[PDB]
């Protein structure tokens, strides 16, 4: 031990602990339970984490996001070649693969994807380190069920430059499906759809689940929706209001822009337990103040195309596994996107009334079953 379960995410990580029978999921230094996937390279230092994405915006350029759409692949692939034209930060080719370059220290600099991915794991295993007491060995890394081998690979690579013990590479949905515990649960084969709606990707998967064995039916989603589209579309809604109100139109002000997208961001969490949220930005735009306030029904106005537009990737899955939606036992809810009250009651309508697996705070879940996993494997 100890037994270590990590998310390595899109744009946030997590990572749990095995202790005493149960999993405790573990905050950061700043209490965070979850920490951003960003490495940010300034004139002195490599900053990670909420240091890292604190500074984002002053740094554009030399702070890193995304490596995992990158880690695995060649520079020459499509995905590669698309999501480049959409990051501030520079992407090269070194021997066929991609790299990130950065200005660190004042010189140019490259990294593999891994590498990136490989600082961002060691401030996980460091967050573990700061909780637990001690050096932490070995862990469970989770990937998307869709990874490949290379991807897979090059994951591992960044747990061994970590200087973690990998004791398996297990698929996020798996993962959340064992935090759950579907694989003891009831006994006969399960269909368990896994619906996963983080702040930029949006993944569904068919599993099924039989004797402890778990198989990939199906995968589906979106690799470009998630929790920052209802952000942008809050963003739009409020910057308009700031104009009809004030006669300021802040858009061509980037950091007008960014204040209301922080404001927004928060916004919408508490929408997901109040029906209504207040935004209270100080001298936003040339000394005017922006407080207002906006309601669950408004917000989820703003994005009625995209909330019911995830049931056709959960249609689409479905069709692939060749399973009518009466097939599915079981709905684990993973990514914070799924605490919206309004994807809940799309999803459950959607599945004639079936109760949903959501007990466990669906941005964790991942890291959670990871821990269990690490757990059983170190047994
Ligand atoms: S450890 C561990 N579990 N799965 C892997 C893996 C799978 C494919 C390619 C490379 C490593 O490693």
């Not at 390279?41 to 990158?70: H, S, Y």
């Not at 952000?231 to 209301?260: C, Q, T, W, Y």
């Not at 930005?281 to 669950?296: A, C, M, N, P, Q």
Request: proline letters at 3%; hydrophobic letters at 35%.
């Amino acid at each position: 031990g100890p037994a270590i379960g990590i998310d390595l995410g899109t744009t946030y990580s997590c990572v749990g602990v095995f202790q005493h029978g149960k999993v405790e999921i573990i905050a950061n230094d700043q209490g965070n339970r979850t920490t951003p996937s960003y490495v940010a390279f300034t004139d002195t230092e490599r900053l990670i984490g909420d240091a890292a994405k604190n500074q984002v915006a002053m740094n554009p350029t030399n702070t890193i996001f995304d490596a995992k759409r990158l880690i695995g692949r060649k520079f020459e692939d499509a995905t590669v070649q698309s999501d480049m034209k959409h990051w501030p930060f520079r992407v090269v080719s070194e021997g066929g693969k991609p790299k990130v370059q950065v200005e660190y220290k004042g010189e140019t600099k490259t990294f593999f994807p891994e590498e990136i991915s490989s600082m961002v794991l060691t401030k996980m295993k460091e967050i573990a380190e700061a909780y637990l007491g001690g050096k932490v060995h070995s862990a469970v890394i989770t990937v998307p069920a869709y990874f490949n081998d290379s991807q897979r690979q090059a994951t591992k690579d960044a747990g061994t430059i970590t200087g973690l013990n990998v004791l398996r590479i297990i698929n996020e949905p798996t993962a959340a499906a064992i935090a759950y515990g579907l694989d003891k649960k009831g006994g006969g084969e399960k269909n368990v759809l896994i619906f996963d709606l983080g702040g930029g990707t949006f993944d569904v998967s068919i599993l099924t689940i039989e004797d402890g064995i778990f198989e990939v039916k199906s995968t589906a989603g979106d690799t470009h929706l998630g929790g920052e589209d209802f952000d942008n579309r809050m963003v739009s809604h409020l910057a308009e209001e700031f104009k009809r109100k004030h006669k300021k139109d802040i858009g061509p002000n980037k950091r007008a822009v960014r204040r209301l997208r922080t404001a927004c961001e928060r916004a919408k969490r508490t929408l997901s337990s109040s029906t209504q949220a207040s935004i209270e930005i100080d001298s936003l735009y040339e000394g005017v103040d922006f407080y207002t306030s906006i309601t669950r029904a408004r917000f989820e106005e703003l994005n009625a195309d995209l909330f019911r537009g995830t049931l056709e990737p959960v249609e689409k899955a479905l069709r692939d596994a060749k399973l009518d939606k009466g097939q599915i036992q079981e709905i684990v809810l993973v990514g914070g996107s799924t605490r919206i009250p309004k994807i809940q009651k799309l999803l459950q309508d959607f599945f004639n009334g079936k109760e949903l697996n959501k007990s466990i705070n669906p941005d964790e879940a991942v890291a959670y079953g990871a821990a269990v996993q690490a757990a059983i494997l170190i047994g």
